[model samples]
Target chain A: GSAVPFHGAHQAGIATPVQDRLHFAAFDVTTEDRAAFVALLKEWTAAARRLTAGHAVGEGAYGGLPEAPPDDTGEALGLKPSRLTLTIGFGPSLFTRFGLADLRPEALADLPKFPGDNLDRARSGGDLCVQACADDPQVAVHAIRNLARIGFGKVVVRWSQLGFGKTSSTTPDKQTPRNLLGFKDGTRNIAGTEKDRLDRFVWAAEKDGTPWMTGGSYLVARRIRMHIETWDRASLQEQEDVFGRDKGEGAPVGKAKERDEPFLKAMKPDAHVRLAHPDSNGGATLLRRGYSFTDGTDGLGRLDAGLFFLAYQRDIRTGFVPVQRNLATDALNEYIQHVGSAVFAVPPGVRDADDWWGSTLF
Target chain B: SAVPFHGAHQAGIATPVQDRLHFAAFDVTTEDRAAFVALLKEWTAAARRLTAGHAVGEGAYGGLPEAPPDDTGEALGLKPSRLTLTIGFGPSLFTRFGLADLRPEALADLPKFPGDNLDRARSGGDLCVQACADDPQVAVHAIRNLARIGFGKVVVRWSQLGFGKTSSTTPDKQTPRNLLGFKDGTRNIAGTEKDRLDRFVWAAEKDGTPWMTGGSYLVARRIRMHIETWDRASLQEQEDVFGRDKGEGAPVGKAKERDEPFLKAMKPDAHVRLAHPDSNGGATLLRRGYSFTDGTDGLGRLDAGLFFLAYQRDIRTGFVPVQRNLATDALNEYIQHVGSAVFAVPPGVRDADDWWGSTLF
Candidate 1:
């Protein structure tokens, strides 16, 4: 399990155990030709295959070339793969450029702007994305940078995010990591072992209007900025009331077990846990693979810190869309704000060594 | 279970480097010396608790729902991870707290170097704290709690987060590669070599600063690398700049990483040759730097580089001449020193009654 298989029926990053670090990127398509896009995709698939196995990406930085191989960045050389996974996705904007507008999945449609959304246009949309998850930051950064290098003239990096610590896990056997809010997040998230749950709620099907995305899933990314200084000043009970869980034990309100069904007492009317519970939303569930980020200062001597939220579901309509709309009135909204948002249709895994990201679509 | 907080010298200086760092600079706001002293005492107690894997005051919960939580609770349930909190007093600190008379001469003003386009806002401070732990959140928790404890007395001026330690005091371990993709600290002084540390790192009574007899000097510089340009350089050109093979991390003509450099055979201005102790007249610095990436710049390039931290017995004899030598190095073309600060670290706390900077008092 340390070196996750890159080829499968579905993407590994979604169901595999989460790694410690993440270097996710959004790319703006630079070329208009479909042939160049296909070639770039093939090249990227080869490179990702090598990097995930801890091998150099064709001649690497030095060996057979007089100059540094423009192919590999050389930073991750001599380092292990660290359980690296490179999952690629296509945004709605890409279909408009490539003549695939008719084939666009309804699930990948643009997300609605919920209330209290102060989103940044600079970071909102992307034509393509590569979610690089690794155990080492340098390795993850190197993986993403090399892909950008390989896709040089075809696409440019629109925006990228680095996560220092993972906030959730598909492998729920160990102690869950606490978010910057100091509460264990995603305690009830879908586990990797729950394949039945995965097929039912996480993976897309051919009957869902897009056969090309049969095994694929929809990804929703939200950069939720926490007012840490203000949250730190809140009383202990107020903080617990917002999350509806005890800070230490992470137990649900009026329950002693973390995974105990929500008793929903002594909690605020708009508590986050209560509003987003499956029982209230037609049993809607989403797999959370979020991470905490402390980018830097906000020019006011305060840290620009928050949780980079990533969730995977079979369809946005039945999954992230309803849950987020329900969370509009969450009591925790006072301390956190949504800044960046995007939605992408992640295709199925590379079926074999010869298969590529969008091989089925063609 | 973790690095001891009290010792003859600070734990972070000679202690093995950690995986992450949360370093910060603070401005002392209180005018009364008594208030500053009390703050220092409380800070020492808090550091002792945090380093021992405990929380601050009444902790994050279980006390009062009416008042604010005592601890930030972010680092709760996380292992100690060998966390160490080391504090230093800047020269401007003496101007306040009526400590002008007790200022150590070892804390002399560091002279400027050529090609140093340092940012004033990011440069000097009244006080600095170096928090290191294997876990990043743990390190940040220490600095945040300290600033919280300081409230109206002190406020954070600037803070930097770093991952992947660039250098290490444990030479036996695998040499860490920096963001530049080169192995660092090949010739670093090991923490186990106490005699060599005394000679080069720890200050002495005979050095004209009695208060710093057991302490050392810290020089922190934020060196930003032009990675987009460096990555495009030829393999030979890159190795010529550093005078070491990129893969093996060997000296210019050597085979293995730890092999001694044959300086005369390498380029005259190679970074390894220029910064070597032999070229700098045997002046040594115990460096504990870390690589950092603060997202991307506005132009869509990585805003990342090394946060260089070095400790020595005296600044005038240690980092000054070494930096002067580096001013003309071939590697200077690809880097810039944007942030800078120097501090006179006092001796560490000795017993239950001893506090940080207690030696001067």
Candidate 2:
């Protein structure tokens, strides 16, 4: 419970239960030298290995050279690993300058500006990104801060999003966690326990055309701004119809039990559950690991709060892209807007002490 | 694992700190005293049920609910997660509700701090609620409903959502860090130390404020840390600014974190010296602050810092004098007090029938 294993065929974060807090940062590469950038990754991976194992990096936070900043940030010292997991993903822009255009996967395409999106350009794009998840907020922030410190000259944090309260790791026996909308979300999400589903929907296979991305997955992140002031005024039946879920038990449409099979046809044609259902989107699915965020107010009388949507799949085209496209006419869309967007191709995990991130390609 | 909603003092101040926070300041619009008093009782009733793993009522919607469907239903299936709702009355509150006669002297008007860049909208309020829970949603849900309940009578003046790691059951081992990467509250008053608590935090009956007996004053400061600039500073510079070791969180010359600090050993303008007891007539405060990030600024930097919430026996000796002492603090360069407010937190409800400010009103 204290630590998630660092060595694996695939990263632990994507499939594991969601961490309580997230400190995700998209970084901009400063140096054009591929070797320097590659060296930074090796160092990043090495520290991540020790961090996940609940150990300090070289020279520790104190006792280091006086002239140089400590290799390890002192904030996380004396703290447990807290099941911290660091996942690295290279963005589409990274391939542009690294002369690694040939290594870019077919699935790693830029996300399109969906209809009704009022996206913020400042927080939208980056060259590379790190997704740090931990049960401890400080631990998660510490890892990101340490990495940002180490990448001082080589990389700068482009945009960082702090997300809190990911629905506790799922269990079939446990109730499906609800969203800020007060409706059960991801009742039908893919679980790590289902290896067959993960292999089919989450991981990229060698035959999928990218040999280096065999066990990797593509990640899509969006900052969904919930217009809570509007939704809070809507009637109960209307709220239920928008999500096509019951108020009490989160039962779909006419079902009594939350886990009961949903009758897509029984829901409204414009209902969220019906339109975004797999039946409507060609049987595609995303391993959703979203978190709720409340970043104070928006100067207006409304909350600048909503869900930080994080999804992973073998291919975005077949997963999030199609599902979101079908949601273009979603009744729930009136209360939510996509304010920020990013897409990254996460590489497979380190196999052992000798293996490193981007080892397969670099 | 529920904290008692009925107590002599509120559960939030000395109780183990929760991981998430939802603090809201409200301006009571109703001129009638009964309208404001009714909200206090309704809020008290809701707090009892909310803290005990129950929903507010059969049909709650904030007047924070998205609908009338099942009392806002968000945290319906969730665990209690040790939620606590602590309510306080600002000076403005007494003026509105004919409570001027009962306004406690302990709730003194906070002086304009040296570095304070006050924002009126986010600063003062007629009343406030401090909601803390293990889960962010629960705390958010708690405040949302209370704000909903106070609908026409009260308008939400401002609010903040902050987070920190849940203190371990054995809290002595868990010292949280701020954005500046220093272990905060190293010498913070411990609840277990009842002697020290009474001496500094809990107001007494003979303390000249009858209604404030067993209650305390709350000083809320929205401190915006210049993190990018602070982070670039050298370790020694950082340590000197805080007068504490970077890794151990010990005093400048001390090796252990818990070692009693030598005030004189620290730099004259060091934070420890300027804010310590000796510097401000031996005054002390119960520091219970949280780290917060309020999105980003216009310059693409994080608008994050500490949401400093301190409880004290009296504001006169507790927060004001000490803050005045910090006029020359070296840490000033790295932080700014952007928003400020002080509220007189009433003693806790005694029974199911008791309301939030029953003693005062």
Candidate 3:
């Protein structure tokens, strides 16, 4: 995946923000009652939706549309909100337990993340169309436990996706802070500059809101598991070499200058050597804003450590795609393998983009 | 995944007199509360029985059995036993956070334990069948948080085929213990004979009851994963070793035994003979039960290790088939890879022949 590059906010009037989301598909098998199972699902969904705070769409319902306008003329814009999708199922024992007549085996797979992977796996299992919405991800965790309480015995829960404004984004860099890999990604990101961050952040003109559909933003939150254990084991030099920059500051090493340390500086053959060996053909870069997820054994044993990588670019082909390809052969590959991955085209806002993501993204 | 032989007593019965077993299936998900869930399930079944009764057969309001029974029996066999199944997906943010999906997408490969591997694997979801009735694996599974609470998550629960017999005429003795040299796999499993004896008892008698119709016998055998320190000696020196195959559990130096007391001879290969010498025939071991499980550091960290073997048997013959073969095979790969161990299989509840595992073979 590759794309044309744009630099810093070009338009004006909106903010670009990040949203945390969770998508979970749950089945209730308690050796208990089916009615009871349904009831529990309802209760758990209620609590889960509340924690994240959004909407709930059943299997028969459509999840709505994406954030961009239908034809660029602006007619169908929606919220770029976070989402959590959960589905339920019943196994063979259920029919026997109920003494019900021969029941055919049944299973429900959730719909695709971006409506694309929906093709191949679409027929295999993930075919459900229902959905639920949430704002904060913490609620998703509670939803898991709540399901457990109701004899939703064999539960399978996962964070579908999470969203971060841009790879060049950062916590400390809120006022122009850079990512951990130390790159001023956003500086040359978007289509505008910092002075008028809105020009590049907001997508209001993109939505054609009709009353009752205001103040919402499309959101996609995912929990990207990072193999930090493998990554941290690498030597400091190797780390800088792969990222093409120093960890302390998003600056290039050996250049004696920071911002001027372009790809060329990091790529010289006989220059101050680095693991990323700039002379190599795989010189590539990606913008990222990842979160951290720490899990203990929970009394089960041996679970702890992880990073949630989040990045967004106008074009996945040119942005996330190239970086991932570079990472494929990068030294970092030793410590990481994508165990869970998904993409979602967040829906537009409820009112104008300015009402939600528009007001938030900038 | 093909085993030369698969043995079972009835479809799934374990008895005290022979083998004992208790099994059931359950369907559980995060949507339902455990307590209310169980109550609702039992209540529904009870309600169905009260209103429609078994006379309606498989065509009741809810549903019926997978297949109709052969008309040979007088009573209608309405299978009230439940095989509950559930599904769960990872939260969207889990991806955003860069965490293991904890969804079918993540742990789908390592799904449920004792699950069938032959068929297309169910995706990364979890399901637990409520196998227990008055038996209650449901409640037990509940308190344990058998699902999302830990790595021992309940993938899916299903009622076991209620096989009534305790012993199978079929043989299931060909399963390999390991690459020979390995012994006493996991440290904690090697128990004292008394411990082994106690474990054997539970293995055969834990689920027997008068009304239960059947019982469950637990079987656990630990093979020490041995390191290859002995398999490398030269053949002449090897003849001076434990009179057995360092490679194939065969007689070392020579293929057969002939009242040879080479252990007494002073040879240049004393070290070799001590380990492979033509001693009183090579040693013999008996094996019964075995399984594998994964152990790892969370955060999807470093490489995970394997939990070693365990098994069960009715008679020594039934359990010693592979053991005797392993004793003389050339696959001592674990000589550097694994350890060795032997644990006796306890006789079921009925005091058989006054000695454990003593009976007709």
lDDT of 3 by residue, A1-362 (tens): 01111112221111233222222332324334645544544454343333233322221012123221111110001111233333222222234443432421111112234311212221112111112212322223223333333232433222222221223332223433332222233432333234233222222123423211122111122343444334433455555555554443445655544444356454433222233331242432222434433332222222233344544333234334444433334554444334444332222232322232112211
lDDT of 2 by residue, B78-157 (tens): 78988988888889877765567878888899877777898877888888889998878889888777766777787778
Candidate 1 off by > 4 Å: A68-70, B165-172
Lowest summed lDDT over 10 consecutive residues: which window, candidate 2 chain B? B59-68
Top-DockQ candidate index: 1
Q: Which tens-of-lDDT digit does each residue in B186-276 have in candidate 1?
A: 8988898999899999989998889888999999999999877887787788888999988889997799998888999889989989999
Reference contacts recovered by each candidate, as fractions? 0.47, 0.30, 0.00
**Candidate number achieving the greatest TM-score relative to the actual structure:** 1
Query: Which has the higher DockQ value, candidate number 1 or candidate number 3?
Result: 1
- Can you tell me the CAPRI class of model 1? medium
What order do candidates take by DockQ, descending?
Answer: 1, 2, 3
DockQ for each candidate? 0.49, 0.39, 0.01
lDDT per residue, candidate 2, A1-362, as tens digits?
37899889998798877777888889889999989988988999988988887777757877665556565657666778888999999899988887899888999977787999888988887888999998888788778777777787898778888887774344455557777777777787888788999999999999999999999999999999988767766888888889887767778978888889889988999998898888899898888888887776676544567898999999989999999999999999999999999999999989999888999979
TM-score, second chain, candidate 1: 0.97
Q: Compare candidates 1 and 3 on TM-score and give the better one.
A: 1
- Model 3: runs farther than 4 Å from truth? A1-230, A255-263, A267-287, A297-304, A352-362, B1-361
